[PDB]
Design a protein around this ligand. Sequence first.
Ligand SMILES: [Co+2]
Length: 248
Amino acid sequence: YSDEVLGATNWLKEKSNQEVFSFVFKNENVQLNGKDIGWNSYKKELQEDELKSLQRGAETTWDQSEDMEWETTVDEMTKKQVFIFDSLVKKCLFEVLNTKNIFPGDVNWFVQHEWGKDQGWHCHVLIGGKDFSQAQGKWWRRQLNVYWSRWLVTACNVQLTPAERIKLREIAEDNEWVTLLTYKHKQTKKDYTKCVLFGNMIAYYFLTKKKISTSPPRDGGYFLSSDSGWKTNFLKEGERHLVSKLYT
Ligand SMILES: [Co+2]
């Protein structure tokens, strides 16, 4: 019952019922003119001050949440790419917040990097607050996908022609590499944004995941999490499960 565990539990419980959007940031494998662009082909470290700061935050989050009782053999390249994606995902969120003139402190958000059995690396984002309403979900997804596609093409480490960069940019938009949770529906039928409950989804779902400690990553595992209160960031896997237990 450390202060960190109690503090995270209390913070989540206070936000148990806060409605938020659910996004997933992802990428898909692309081959352009024989050039393979895989999930981890975006390893340029861009020298923009804010991005650099965000990437340092991800590194330190990884370092502090590492359990050293047990060994960890995650590939260095994998860690590097996840740290870079953490900074890029957050840059996208903050750019859209700027568009809406939303003070970052008025926003609740939670980010968790995972490895899916089929899709591989992806990043869940929960985000909402007083300046957010359900009808704005589709606009948010579109805007996020604009910035996500833009940053991915900038961060890509594969030597690309201008025509190839534009093709990659349009692939990332057309194929919706940022998804928005909606209610289930028919293909022809309208889709409605499905808001989720912030604290409940974090305590009862995201914090129940198993930590990735190997390459290849365990199917369904998580790499790294963070939130707007820096509450879950540094928690080790065992501590995260303790938070879930206390939350109930
Ligand atoms: Co997932």
